[PDB]
From TrEMBL, chains A, B:
GO terms for cellular component: membrane. It is found in: Membrane. The lineage of its organism: Bacteria, Pseudomonadati, Pseudomonadota, Gammaproteobacteria, Enterobacterales. Keywords: Membrane, Plasmid, Transmembrane, Transmembrane helix. The chain crosses the membrane at residues 28-52. InterPro entries: T4SS_VirB3/TrbD/AvhB. This is TrwM protein.
Automatic annotation (TrEMBL), chain D:
The chain holds residues 292 to 339 of 823 of the full protein. This is Type IV secretion system protein virB4. Belongs to the TrbE/VirB4 family. Coiled coil: none annotated. It comes from Salmonella dublin.
Amino acid sequence: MKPPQQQHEAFPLFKGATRLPTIWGVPMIPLMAMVMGVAVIALTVSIWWWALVPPLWFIMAQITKNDDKAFRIWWLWIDTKFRNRNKGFWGASSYSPANYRKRR
Amino acid sequence: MKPPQQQHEAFPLFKGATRLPTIWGVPMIPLMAMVMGVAVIALTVSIWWWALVPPLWFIMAQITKNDDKAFRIWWLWIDTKFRNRNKGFWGASSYSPANYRKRR
Amino acid sequence: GMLEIREYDDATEPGQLNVLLESDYEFVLTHSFSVLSRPAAKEYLQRHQKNLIDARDVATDQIEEIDEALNQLISGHFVMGEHHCTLTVYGETVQQ
Amino acid sequence: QKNLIDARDVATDQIEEIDEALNQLISGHFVMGEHHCTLTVYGETVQQ
């Protein structure tokens, strides 16, 4: 059927949605992760390796511009469905209902 | 008679129609055909023959600008009505209805 | 099987999610509105204004719309917030 | 838009029309597509 529809009276929705706080067009938290990683590489192997910044930084800008919140999804997956140990045994990631906190 | 007419309320039609993907104002596929042909000429007879590019390239730009999709019509004709063998016997290009695929 | 909304449009027509009331599939819709401070909301809207105004001058979508948007937000007529909607359909077999 | 704006500034056909065109297309009000119309008339003799 046709429940209530629009006739240009619809309440405006502005596209300031998910315009995340970005510097150079990239969010703070993932760019800081890249800074930490490249700093680790620079301190570990060689010091010529702050040239690893612009390539991955540009690829991250292209990723963020297309799909503004990819990194939050990435971190959620990594934290939850990647940590869960017995993925293989169950055929799927499962959490026991009864609270077996290793106590007795 | 006069079926429904216009009163400037007509839905806009923009002239992005058949603005084909063009480099220098010429579509990719025919220009690549010219590149292949001129490369063949250059490799075959003489190497001074990448001067054959600008004349025919300019004539192709003038052809495309006037009539944006001449090359598609050209290729369709060449593929179908030019290949059909028995044009002379029938007085016209004809395809047999019964599927004689040379089998028995 | 969960699902997610990620792309709005130039509209907030009332009750646009009515169509999932008449469903043949038993589900659980969800929402969230983490109400947000007036300075932070004004900053988000200022960010949208800045991004938009750093471009070609669209006649009306550009200027007056965000004029009235910001003026309402200061004059207390709406309160921005962080939102997410996750329709999850329940079923008996994975194909279904 | 680019081809049009690479020219003299027509007052209204140029700017606002493609402004609203692109804004609708993003806001989901029409979907472009590739189109061709071929009227074929049937008859009994080639003159007709």
